[PDB]
Amino acid sequence: EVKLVESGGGLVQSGGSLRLSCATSGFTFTDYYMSWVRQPPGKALEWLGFIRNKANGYTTEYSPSVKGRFTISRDNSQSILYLQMNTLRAEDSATYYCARDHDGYYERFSYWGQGTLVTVSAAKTTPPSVYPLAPGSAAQTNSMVTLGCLVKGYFPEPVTVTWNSGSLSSGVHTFPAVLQSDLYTLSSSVTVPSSTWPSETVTCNVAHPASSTKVDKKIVPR
Amino acid sequence: DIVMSQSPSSLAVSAGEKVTMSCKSSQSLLNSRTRKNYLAWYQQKPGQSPKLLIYWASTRESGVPDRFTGSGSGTDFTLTITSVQAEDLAVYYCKQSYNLRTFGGGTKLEIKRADAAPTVSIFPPSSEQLTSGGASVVCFLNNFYPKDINVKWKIDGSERQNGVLNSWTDQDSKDSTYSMSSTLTLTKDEYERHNSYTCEATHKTSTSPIVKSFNRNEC
Ligand SMILES: O=C(O)[C@@]1(O)C[C@@H](O)[C@@H](O)[C@@H]([C@H](O)CO)O1
Numbered sequence: 001e002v003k004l005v006e007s008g009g010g011l012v013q014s015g016g017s018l019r020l021s022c023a024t025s026g027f028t029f030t031d032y033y034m035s036w037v038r039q040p041p042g043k044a045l046e047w048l049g050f051i052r053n054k055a056n057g058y059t060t061e062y063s064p065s066v067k068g069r070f071t072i073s074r075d076n077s078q079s080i081l082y083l084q085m086n087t088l089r090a091e092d093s094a095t096y097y098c099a100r101d102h103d104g105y106y107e108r109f110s111y112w113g114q115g116t117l118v119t120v121s122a123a124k125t126t127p128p129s130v131y132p133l134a135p136g137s138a139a140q141t142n143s144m145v146t147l148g149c150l151v152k153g154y155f156p157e158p159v160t161v162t163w164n165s166g167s168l169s170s171g172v173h174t175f176p177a178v179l180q181s182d183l184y185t186l187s188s189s190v191t192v193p194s195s196t197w198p199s200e201t202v203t204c205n206v207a208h209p210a211s212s213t214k215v216d217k218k219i220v221p222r
Numbered sequence: 223d224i225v226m227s228q229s230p231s232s233l234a235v236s237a238g239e240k241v242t243m244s245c246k247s248s249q250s251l252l253n254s255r256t257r258k259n260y261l262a263w264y265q266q267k268p269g270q271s272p273k274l275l276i277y278w279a280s281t282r283e284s285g286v287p288d289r290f291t292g293s294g295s296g297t298d299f300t301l302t303i304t305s306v307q308a309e310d311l312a313v314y315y316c317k318q319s320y321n322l323r324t325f326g327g328g329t330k331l332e333i334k335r336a337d338a339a340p341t342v343s344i345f346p347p348s349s350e351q352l353t354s355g356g357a358s359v360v361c362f363l364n365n366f367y368p369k370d371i372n373v374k375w376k377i378d379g380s381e382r383q384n385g386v387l388n389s390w391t392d393q394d395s396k397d398s399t400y401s402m403s404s405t406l407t408l409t410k411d412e413y414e415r416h417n418s419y420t421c422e423a424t425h426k427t428s429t430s431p432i433v434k435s436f437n438r439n440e441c
């Protein structure tokens with residue numbers, strides 16, 4: 001299997017520097033150009049630069065938008081791709097992707113990483129408060145029951161939420177975070193048969209990488 | 223100097239129907255040496271990375287369904303989707319690689335489906351939140367269509383608008399519905415001055431609002 005995995009994203013202040021890495025496997029790394037592409041939240045993809053393959057001396061090119069400020073490199077022993085960013089500004093806040101590029105024959109980006117989120121801001125890292133969402137003395141018995149978790153007051157993005165360590169997958173909605181007085185809040189709902197809860201356990205697993213927060217919140221009745 | 227532009231910015235299509243979208247380059251992408259157009263299409267589903275669909279304008283990548291077809295040449299390209307499926311919900315980007323690389327601005331494809339009423343659930347503040355002085359009340363409005371919806375919060379029968387935040391999900395990849403969360407935040411002191419908390423949803427699927435409520439005395 002081909003694998004590309006970005007790492008290194010997180011919070012940085014304006015004017016700072018930050019280096020992203022992209023670990024690859026499942027293909028002959030040296031045969032391929034590699035590109036970095038970024039995407040501000042809810043905006044379009046922007047190509048940033050590439051580094052060529054061994055046949056082309058591993059030379060680099062950049063978009064005018066970052067040339068002279070961003071530098072791309074590669075570790076050909078370990079098949080890792082790098083992106084060094086300097087003098088960062090708000091406009092640089094985005095999800096950064098690495099992508100496999102040209103091989104000398106095909107014109108395509110065959111594979112993309114999952115992306116790493118960079119946030120440029122002066123605000124401080126704040127861990128989330130995670131609160132269970134259980135029905136009050138409501139109808140409850142409707143063949144189904146909807147539970148949730150409120151993930152409140154964190155910074156920066158992102159957070160991850162799963163249910164029953166991913167075991168509950170269908171019937172889950174996670175609502176996009178909203179920014180308020182410098183803090184994000186989101187919620188997640190999960191829907192299951194009420195014969196199964198609270199007969200069986202339902203727990204939301206929340207992680208906030210910026211603060212290395214890991215939370216398991218069991219949803220308890222009453 | 224290769225400007226890429228796409229059209230439309232967005233549209234919606236019902237399942238089973240055809241989708242047509244356009245991509246223009248400020249200069250020809252046809253490479254004279256290889257006689258191919260250096261133009262690729264990518265699909266970015268909600269919450270996912272982009273995925274290669276078509277390259278060399280018309281070559282369909284292995285593992286990509288036949289209903290996706292790229293066409294065009296020179297400065298003008300088209301991606302056609304026949305028999306659209308719910309899962310095709312995505313933003314579609316075109317990208318030139320004739321001179322370095324440049325992406326178009328994307329086309330957002332929404333799926334049209336039959337109107338559906340929301341399923342509404344209300345949740346009182348947890349004891350763990352109240353302990354620290356705050357009180358959030360949450361309402362889920364799940365699996366409805368179309369996206370437009372109104373939520374009102376009433377406390378002891380009176381509407382309250384301040385301290386309310388709303389968030390819609392992206393359309394669902396399987397049932398083409400939306401969901402939305404409405405969260406009302408109060409201080410503990412103010413939460414404890416009132417008894418009834420109500421979230422009312424008005425959606426075009428009924429002239430009757432769907433009302434969910436809880437009373438603090440009953441907690
Ligand atoms: O600049 C290049 O290294 C490259 O080979 C990249 C290719 O994608 C392609 O753009 C090519 C041009 O067609 C020139 O041959 O240049």
Ligand SMILES: [Mg+2]
Pocket residue numbers: 173364365394397399400401
């Ligand atoms: Mg749904």
Ligand SMILES: [Zn+2]
Pocket residue numbers: 059060061
């Ligand atoms: Zn050069």
